[PDB]
Structure 1
Amino acid sequence: MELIRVPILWHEMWHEGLEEASRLYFGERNVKGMFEVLEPLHAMMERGPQTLKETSFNQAYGRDLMEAQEWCRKYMKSGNVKDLTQAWDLYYHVFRRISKQ
């Protein structure tokens, strides 16, 4: 509860990240881009940490992303928009939180 927001930060990658994924996603119903957007973005967050202060952030969603991530892998393997939508839902929740303040 800081009500503070930074322009050039992680939240910046989420906004711009999802922004592109979504933009491309809706563009030509190509979720491929989205996956390639998070793949790195997410990866970057994994291999590219920040600090104990950010640890809570990655953890806060750590489980969230994990769930949505599973719905993704399940979707990519299985193949179901429903699952895809759910994954997009989970993300929005996390992506929405990072923004919500």
Structure 2
Amino acid sequence: ELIRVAILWHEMWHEGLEEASRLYFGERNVKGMFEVLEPLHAMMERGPQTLKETSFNQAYGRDLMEAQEWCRKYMKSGNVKDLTQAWDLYYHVFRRISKQ
């Protein structure tokens, strides 16, 4: 653990998903979760660096990765019908990517 700074993506994902999935969970401010997950889209698309932050795109490509990738859909469709599923991918992965 903490090889250098204990950075890792999973680490920011645990809370980057909690601070997001919570802003929607019972905050009725899905717009807020979109701001904490906004960098989690870019910090997930830029690509893997070392070989540690790759237990999500290769384990659950459909998780957060797809729960967000539906941006062109969440933008034009803007239907909570995608967010209700994104919450499932976020919550379903919240335990998966957790590695409890």
- State the TM-score bracket (shorter-chain normalisation): 0.5 to 0.7
**Structure 1's 74 and 60: CA in aligned 2 closer, same or farther, altered over 3 A?**
same
**Structure 1's 56 and 21: CA in aligned 2 closer, same or farther, altered over 3 A?**
closer
**Structure 1's 22 and 39: CA in aligned 2 closer, same or farther, altered over 3 A?**
same
In structure 2, the gaps of 5 or more residues are none
Identical aligned residues as a percent: 99
Across the two proteins, how many residue pairs are aligned to each other? 100
- Whether contact under 8 Å (1:15, 1:95) holds in the other structure is yes
- Whether contact under 8 Å (2:21, 2:87) holds in the other structure is no
**Structure 1's 5 and 58: CA in aligned 2 closer, same or farther, altered over 3 A?**
farther
CA RMSD of aligned residues (A): 3.8
Secondary structure of the residue aligned to 1:59 is: coil
- Whether contact under 8 Å (2:55, 2:97) holds in the other structure is no
**C-alpha deviation, 1:31, in angstroms:** 0.8
- Whether contact under 8 Å (2:74, 2:82) holds in the other structure is yes
In structure 1, the gaps of 5 or more residues are none
**Structure 1's 72 and 88: CA in aligned 2 closer, same or farther, altered over 3 A?**
farther
Deviation string 1:20-57 (CA, Å, 9 cap, x unpaired) is 11333346411111112112023113326332343344
**Structure 1's 92 and 6: CA in aligned 2 closer, same or farther, altered over 3 A?**
farther
Q: Which has the higher helix share?
A: 1
Secondary structure of the residue aligned to 2:3 is: coil
